[PDB]
Amino acid sequence: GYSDRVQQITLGNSTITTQEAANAVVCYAEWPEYLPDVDASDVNKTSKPDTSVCRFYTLDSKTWTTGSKGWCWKLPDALKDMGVFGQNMFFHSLGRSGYTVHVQCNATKFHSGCLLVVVIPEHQLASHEGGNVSVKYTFTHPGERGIDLSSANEVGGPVKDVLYNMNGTLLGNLLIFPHQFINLRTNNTATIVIPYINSVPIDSMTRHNNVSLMVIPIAPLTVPTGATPSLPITVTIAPMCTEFSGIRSKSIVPQ
Amino acid sequence: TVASISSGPKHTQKVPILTANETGATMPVLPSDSIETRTTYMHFNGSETDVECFLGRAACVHVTEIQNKDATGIDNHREAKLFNDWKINLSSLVQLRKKLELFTYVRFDSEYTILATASQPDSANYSSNLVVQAMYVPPGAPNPKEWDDYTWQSASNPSVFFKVGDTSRFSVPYVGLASAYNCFYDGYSHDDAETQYGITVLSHMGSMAFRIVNEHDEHKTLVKIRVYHRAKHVEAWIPRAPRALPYTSIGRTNYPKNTEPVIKKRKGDIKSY
Amino acid sequence: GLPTTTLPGSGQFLTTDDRQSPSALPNYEPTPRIHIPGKVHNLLEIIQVDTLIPMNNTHTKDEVNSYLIPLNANRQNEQVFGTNLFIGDGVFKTTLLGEIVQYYTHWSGSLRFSLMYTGPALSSAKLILAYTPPGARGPQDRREAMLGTHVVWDIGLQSTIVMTIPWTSGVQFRYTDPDTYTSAGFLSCWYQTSLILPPETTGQVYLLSFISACPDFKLRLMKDTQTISQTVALTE
Amino acid sequence: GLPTTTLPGSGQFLTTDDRQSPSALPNYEPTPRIHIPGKVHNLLEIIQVDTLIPMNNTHTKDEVNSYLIPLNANRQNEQVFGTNLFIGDGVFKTTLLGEIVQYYTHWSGSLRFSLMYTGPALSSAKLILAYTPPGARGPQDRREAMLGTHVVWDIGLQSTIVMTIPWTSGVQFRYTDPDTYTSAGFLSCWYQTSLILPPETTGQVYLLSFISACPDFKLRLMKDTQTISQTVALTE
Amino acid sequence: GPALSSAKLILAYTPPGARGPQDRREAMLGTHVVWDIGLQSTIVMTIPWTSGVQFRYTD
Amino acid sequence: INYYKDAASTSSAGQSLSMDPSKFTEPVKDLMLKGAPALN
Amino acid sequence: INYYKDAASTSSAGQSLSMDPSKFTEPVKDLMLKGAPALN
Ligand SMILES: Cc1cc(CCCCCCCOc2ccc(C3=N[C@@H](C)CO3)cc2)on1
């Protein structure tokens, strides 16, 4: 009586149940694991807070309306302030982590709409100015708020044009990245497990984000007659196999 | 190898063509799941689509130019093209760039070919064979100031001398600092409020300096350098969506404003053929 | 001293030749490789992942909407969409498949075309997708369409339908770039019965459509893509 | 006559290639080698010998005094010295380590920083040395400093203290030449308790400081040093 | 609720030492279960014994 | 025959002949069998 | 393959792979053990 459909994920002191899942994606078919010695470089023993950092943090909720263009969060940024995960983050020189991402959106059998939930490794954004204008730090570190693709261009911020993925590629091809759809008629959640993907064994958690999670409405939300025209979307994310190394004074970052 | 097996009528409870794309999978459906097929063999291996093959041919990565002329009274050799210099990079020209950016991280050895041809714009006489010197000036090492500085001694820095009209060829191991080169980097060099964003900060690989060894003749001679790059021993990770809009800058993803629609509009209906 | 003779071609530079060269950095030790998920070995590996087709090409500036094929409730017998199968051009051209095919001169193989339905769960519909092999015109009505490769799709719990365009061909390779002799057919879709919405519901519903290549597929003779060009070298 | 083809690169002179050549002096017999103590095989052998760092760089012309770090009796909580760790520049630059690092482009490894105390034997002191890994600012007070790599040094019979800056890094190599992304941290030193001089004694005492590389160390990609240049050829 | 409705609730247990949470952000950092209302009508949350002292008074 | 000492100086590599699209086409956590229902 | 008769004409030598810093780092007459007191 197991269905692909019902699932439970327990991680730390927190549990999620979905009764309307559509399997789960594990990026590149690899599950998060700690850093092996053969791959290690820094000689420091690392710190593995385990259950105090590897639990589920639910970010603040978004509201899908008929005019929504899509939202974008960066990792580990989105979690920069969650509990002890965040403290560890500002206090060590280097850290590394994988995540379980669970995006939630329920409706009824009269609604229609379909969101794309995708994880993009190394999502370098484009400046809407063109040329070689850079995208300032603050703009690519929105924190739990994430970036709202239907917000206005700002100065020093990225471009927010959806048919171009914020980088000069077409929305249609985002499907080459680990992703899952939430089609109100099928699905009510999306779950993706992200292994740590980098060109170095461990890195800085503040100067470099290693994935952007993106939720994009593709088939517009259509509510039943005289229904309220909107649904909330909630994102809950859990660091998994986290390791921190090179402890010290506590980083100070712009803004 | 069979490309298609033989398959006949079906009346089952087992439907391989109904799936749920919401899952993120592309189910491996074949012609024989939905029509009646006959056996056929592949006769093919997919040899020429190997990434080593795809990135393994020489591509032009840079065209520069230097001239041989009397430096007498020149206050700025660099500025007179008495010796140009190139900030090594692999995204200045776009044919090869779009190919590499199909991947996120890439690792390979490089084979460089350098072709140098001469031009004599101002009606001339006898051209004495010019010899070009190509130095590798990695970051931290004195960079040439005049076309005949102590720098050109290049006692510790690899340099090649070849003749204009000829070609020079040598191969450099993968010089990246990390395990792969980042084709993309969503980071900064530090948490500064105004530091540049992108890979520009990861791309540091220094520059390469060219000059003519010959002193000047009576006329002036323009030498134009073309650098070709071939990846050998390629390793590529994490495929990405291909580049759709035009490029504007080395190292940023930025596209131009008021660009044009990249998807061709139908001449007719959705229903049109 | 061993006697030699040099042949025609000596001194040429062929960008496609593969030989040994002296290393400029004798004895240098590259950084160790660490493990990174996601390694690609063949472009054939990636063109089997499906991506969305902007089938609804009828707009005037690129929009998220050209990915949506609309469906109308209560129409009978009528046609949902049509397209030829020049995978290197037209709707296909910006898709990952289209985009890679363009790096090669010839292609052969089967294509997988699937449609995922997004209408309310309490609605229902039966569509017919038809592949018309080279030699006939794009079908003009379902009767015409239904006599070639087709699948009646019944919209249900299982949200997507995967249609295969089996390789139908005399010549074993076709050019990517639109050739006549080498042309592959048409793909059309019609109401089999009709879309029906539940009460309290209204308007258009949309289908999303994807394209990917079957394991069947072959691409050969690499060349340059018409999809990218430039007028001056970029700088930093 | 055997048929050949010459490739691109024929006739080039690459200063780094390694091939055979005819000897100009056929059959000549070199002088026998005799034994000489001191043979060097690797530059890695010598950068492990420690040499003095002109830490006290604050003078205006080079002097023996910039090797001396002064210490004041009776100060509490305060800071003895500070420096970043750009081994290819600044204090490090003229040291043997600094001087060799400059012949290479990349370095990786642990550094050994030691301090030898020279104050009267009847005095005493407790100092804290702190290494701050990349990512934070140079510490501004001991509280800040003590939260990173540190050693409380107790001045005793044993005159020197050897602090190691363990390799703390994401990227496995850093440039010698000052790079940001690639930067290595800061090194600071503060009074842990304070220097105390015996009676009949007065003034400043000094610490000498050395730097050498751990056996850990790697240097790669040789290049030319900014530390030497010239304007005309020398003559006899 | 009617069978054709849907809902997602979070239940949170806050162990001794902090105040009753004032908003979900605060609540979600302690023991919690996201409950998805479905066919299966009930959700069972456990308040695991979190305690220094091994017994507590009822009163 | 390599004429040169360093590995970078050797010619192009030889075909992976690796080929495994499943990391890209089927990264699902619970295995899907073709023919069995997608969602149970 | 050497094509030439004299030894000077051969290519570069091959890595010492000797490496022993102790003549430079520890030329002390009585052996010092790390961990034992420097001066007894
Ligand atoms: C004489 C002589 C001249 C030289 C040059 C040595 C080669 C050094 C160049 C190293 C390779 O450079 C790069 C630069 C960028 C990238 C890269 N940038 C990203 C888009 C992807 O890859 C890769 C290699 O050596 N000897």
Rounded to whole angstroms, the Cα distance separating A102 from C19 reads 51
3-state secondary structure of B243: strand
Angstrom CA distances, B153 to B171, B241, B245, D223, D227, stand at: 21, 46, 45, 12, 14
Sheet holding D79-84, edge to edge: D79-84, D186-191, D126-132, D149-154
Q: For residue B108, which phi and psi values (nearest 5 degrees)?
A: -165, 160
The alpha carbon of C102 and the centre of ligand 1 are apart by a number of angstroms equal to: 28
Q: Do F9 and C18 touch (CB under 8 A)?
A: no
**∠ CA B89-B92-B95 to the nearest 5 degrees?**
115
Q: Do C49 and F23 touch (CB under 8 A)?
A: no
Q: Which residue of B has its CA nearest to C207?
A: B21
Rounded to whole angstroms, the Cα distance separating C208 from C105 reads 29
The alpha carbon of B248 and the centre of ligand 1 are apart by a number of angstroms equal to: 21
CB-based contacts of B50: which residues, under 8 Å, 6+ apart? C41, C42, F15, F16
Inform me whether the C-beta atom of residue D38 falls under 8 Å from chain G C-beta atoms: yes
Domain limits of chain B? Answer: 1-273
Q: How many H-runs (helices) and E-runs (strands) does chain A carry?
A: 1, 13
Give the count of beta carbons closer than 10 Å to the beta carbon of residue A87. 16
Q: Do A56 and E32 touch (CB under 8 A)?
A: yes
Q: State the CATH number of the domain containing residue A35.
A: 2.60.120.20
DSSP B65: E
- To one decimal, the resolution in angstroms is 3.0
Q: Ligand 1 atom closest to Cα of B175?
A: 10
Q: How was this structure determined?
A: X-ray
Q: Structure tokens of B230?
A: 């071939």
| B138, D105 contact by CB (below 8 A) | yes
Q: Structure tokens of D106?
A: 């990349």
Q: Which residues of A touch F36 (CB under 8 A)?
A: none
Atom 4, ligand 1: which residue's CA is nearest?
B136
| Domain membership of residue A42 as a residue range | 1-255
Closest CA relative to residue E51, chosen from E14, E21, E16? E16
User: If residue B51 lies in a helix (H) or strand (E), which one and from where to where?
Assistant: helix B51-55
Which of D23, D41, D157 lies nearest to residue G16, judging by beta carbons?
Answer: D41
Rounded to whole angstroms, the Cα distance separating B261 from B247 reads 15
| A5, A189 contact by CB (below 8 A) | no
- For residue C215, the distance in angstroms to the closest alpha carbon of chain F comes to 10
CB-based contacts of B264: which residues, under 8 Å, 6+ apart? C57, C89, C90, C93
The alpha carbon of B176 and the centre of ligand 1 are apart by a number of angstroms equal to: 9
Give the count of beta carbons closer than 10 Å to the beta carbon of residue A50. 11
Name all residues whose Cβ lies below 6 A of ligand 1.
Answer: B 88-91, 100, 106, 110, 134, 136, 158-160, 170, 172, 175, 181, 183, 203, 205, 208; C 24
Alpha carbon dihedral G13, G17, G21, G24, in 10-degree steps, equals -10
| A26, F27 contact by CB (below 8 A) | yes
| Domain membership of residue C9 as a residue range | 1-236
Rounded to whole angstroms, the Cα distance separating B158 from F3 reads 20
Rounded to whole angstroms, the Cα distance separating C33 from C30 reads 9
Q: Which residues of A touch C52 (CB under 8 A)?
A: 171-173, 175, 218
Q: Where are the beta strands (DSSP E) in chain A?
A: 7-11, 14-18, 25-26, 57-58, 62-65, 71-75, 92-104, 112-121, 147-148, 179-183, 189-194, 211-222, 230-247
| CATH 2.60.120.20 matches B1-273 | yes
DSSP C65: G
Rounded to whole angstroms, the Cα distance separating F24 from F13 reads 24
CB-based contacts of B99: which residues, under 8 Å, 6+ apart? B54, B55, B59, C103
Q: Calculate the CA A42 to chain-centre distance.
A: 27
Rounded to whole angstroms, the Cα distance separating D221 from D18 reads 17
Angstrom CA distances, D110 to A42, A64, A245, D102, stand at: 10, 53, 16, 17
Inform me whether the C-beta atom of residue A2 falls under 8 Å from chain F C-beta atoms: yes
Q: Do G21 and D49 touch (CB under 8 A)?
A: yes
Q: Do D221 and C2 touch (CB under 8 A)?
A: no
Closest CA relative to residue D125, chosen from D156, D163, D146, D150? D156
Q: State the CATH number of the domain containing residue D75.
A: 2.60.120.20
Q: After which residues is chain B broken (C to N over 2.5 A)?
A: none
Q: Do A248 and D171 touch (CB under 8 A)?
A: no
Indicate contact of G with A: 3+ CB pairs under 8 A.
no
Total residue length of chain G: 40
Q: Which residues of D touch C6 (CB under 8 A)?
A: 3-6
Which of D41, D49, D157 lies nearest to residue G19, judging by beta carbons?
Answer: D41
Q: Which residues of F touch B240 (CB under 8 A)?
A: none
Is the backbone of residue A146 left (phi > 0), alpha (psi -120 to 50) or beta? left
Query: If you search the block for the tokens 């010698």, which residue do you land on?
Result: D176
Rounded to whole angstroms, the Cα distance separating A232 from A71 reads 13
| B92, B247 contact by CB (below 8 A) | no
Test the B interface: residue of C16, C50, C62 with most B CBs within 10 Å = C62
CATH assignment of G1-40, among 3.30.420.10, 1.20.1260.10, 4.10.80.10, 3.30.420.40: 4.10.80.10
Angstrom CA distances, B140 to B204, D47, D103, stand at: 11, 19, 9
Q: Is the dihedral of CA C57, C59, C61, C66 positive or negative?
A: negative
Rounded to whole angstroms, the Cα distance separating D142 from D77 reads 7
DSSP B262: S
Give the long-range contacts of residues B119-128, CB within 8 A, separation 24 or more. B119/B221, B119/B222, B119/B223, B119/B224, B120/B219, B120/B220, B120/B221, B120/B222, B121/B220, B121/B222, B122/B219, B122/B220, B124/B219, B125/B218, B125/B219, B126/B217, B127/B217, B127/B219, B127/B221, B128/B214, B128/B217
Domains contained in chain D, number: 1
DSSP A163: G
**∠ CA B20-C50-A212 to the nearest 5 degrees?**
90
| E36, A7 contact by CB (below 8 A) | no
Q: DSSP states of chain D as a string?
A: -EEE-PPTTTT-EETT-------SSTT--PPPP---S-----HHHHTTS-EE--TTTTSSS--GGGSEEEE-BT--S-EEEEEE--TTSGGGGGSHHHHHHTTEEEEES-EEEEEEE-S-TT-B-EEEEEEE-BTBPPPSSHHHHHTSEEEEEE-SSS-EEEEEE----SSS-EESS--STT---EEEEEESS-BBPPTT--S-EEEEEEEEE-TT-EEEEE---TT---SS----
Inform me whether the C-beta atom of residue D203 falls under 8 Å from chain C C-beta atoms: no
Inform me whether the C-beta atom of residue C206 falls under 8 Å from chain A C-beta atoms: yes
Domains contained in chain A, number: 1
**∠ CA A116-A120-A122 to the nearest 5 degrees?**
160
Rounded to whole angstroms, the Cα distance separating C127 from C196 reads 12
Q: Do B140 and D173 touch (CB under 8 A)?
A: no
| A145, A96 contact by CB (below 8 A) | no
| B107, B179 contact by CB (below 8 A) | yes
**∠ CA D85-D91-D97 to the nearest 5 degrees?**
75
Indicate contact of F with E: 3+ CB pairs under 8 A.
no
Greatest Cα pair distance in chain A: 63
Give the count of beta carbons closer than 10 Å to the beta carbon of residue G27. 10
3-state secondary structure of B42: coil
Residues paired with B210 in a beta bridge: B134
Q: Which residue of A has its CA nearest to C64?
A: A163
CB-based contacts of A183: which residues, under 8 Å, 6+ apart? A113, A114, A219, B22, C116, C118, C159
Ligand 1 site-directed mutation target among C21, C25, C28, most atoms within 8 Å of CB: C25
Atom 18, ligand 1: which residue's CA is nearest?
B90
- For residue E59, the distance in angstroms to the closest alpha carbon of chain A comes to 28
Q: Calculate the CA F3 to chain-centre distance.
A: 31
Whether the ω angle into residue A76 lies within 30 degrees of 0, i.e. cis, is yes
What is the distance between the terminal CA atoms of chain C, rounded to a whole angstrom?
52
Q: Calculate the CA B131 to chain-centre distance.
A: 27
Amino acid letter at C58?
Answer: T
Rounded to whole angstroms, the Cα distance separating E39 from C161 reads 27
Q: Structure tokens of D26?
A: 């056929």
Is the backbone of residue G29 left (phi > 0), alpha (psi -120 to 50) or beta? alpha
